[PDB]
Curated annotation (Swiss-Prot):
It is found in: Secreted. A probable mono(ADP-ribosyl)transferase, it may ADP-ribosylate Arg in target protein(s). Upon expression in yeast cells causes cell death. Belongs to the Arg-specific ADP-ribosyltransferase family. GO terms for cellular component: extracellular region. This is Putative NAD(+)--arginine ADP-ribosyltransferase Vis. NAD(+) binds at residues 45-57, 94-97, 114, 166. It catalyses: L-arginyl-[protein] + NAD(+) = N(omega)-(ADP-D-ribosyl)-L-arginyl-[protein] + nicotinamide + H(+). Disulfide bonds: none annotated. Residues 11-198 form the TR mART core domain. It comes from Vibrio splendidus (strain 12B01). GO terms for molecular function: NAD+-protein-arginine ADP-ribosyltransferase activity; nucleotide binding; nucleotidyltransferase activity; toxin activity. InterPro entries: ADP-ribosyltransferase (IPR003540). Keywords: Glycosyltransferase, NAD, NADP, Nucleotide-binding, Nucleotidyltransferase, Secreted, Signal, Toxin, Transferase, Virulence.
Amino acid sequence: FDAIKQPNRSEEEVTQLAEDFKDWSKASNYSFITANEKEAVEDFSISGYQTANDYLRATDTSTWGVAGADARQYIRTVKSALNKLPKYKGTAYRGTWVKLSLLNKLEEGDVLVEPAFTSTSTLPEVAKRFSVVHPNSPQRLKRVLFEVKINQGGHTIAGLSSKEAEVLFAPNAHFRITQIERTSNHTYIGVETVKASAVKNTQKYNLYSGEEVEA
Ligand SMILES: N=C(N)NCCCCN
């Protein structure tokens, strides 16, 4: 996991790489994409992901109201747009917070299911930015830095945004664990994208709630 652990590259080099990825993204386009779809994706990266991901993670969305209908529409529009954007395959990174109770159970070959959209960056510097602050919660959480091998599901949204080199998955993405390294304050987890329907005879867990997902 030294790609993650090592010191960040300079602003200049990271900004350059992000710009090159944005360029590659645009160059790799799509003609079917709507104005509402481009606009939803631009908004997504800045603020929209906050509402969409809360909706996707919510135990009870009967309480949301008119805002639920808007959230469903937004999610549908973002998923539709994603399918029209260029695929990315290669390595990407994501920093997040996970229940220690789940982390304690995890082994290589277990599958993690993200109920929200999954946003990753090709730049570990950018990934590390989004997990700096410890959230407040009833739950004991620990910082997790994922190294993600992407061979399906990931689409670049960097063409439509930003120096984030962002690659996005639709909700319910499944990730098979290939390696775990546990330390104090940081757990590193290597994962590979897998198709849900190809997951057999292993244990799946919901990455947010920590609950087992039915085989
Ligand atoms: N990596 C996270 N924890 N969050 C991703 C935020 C997505 C912003 N474009």
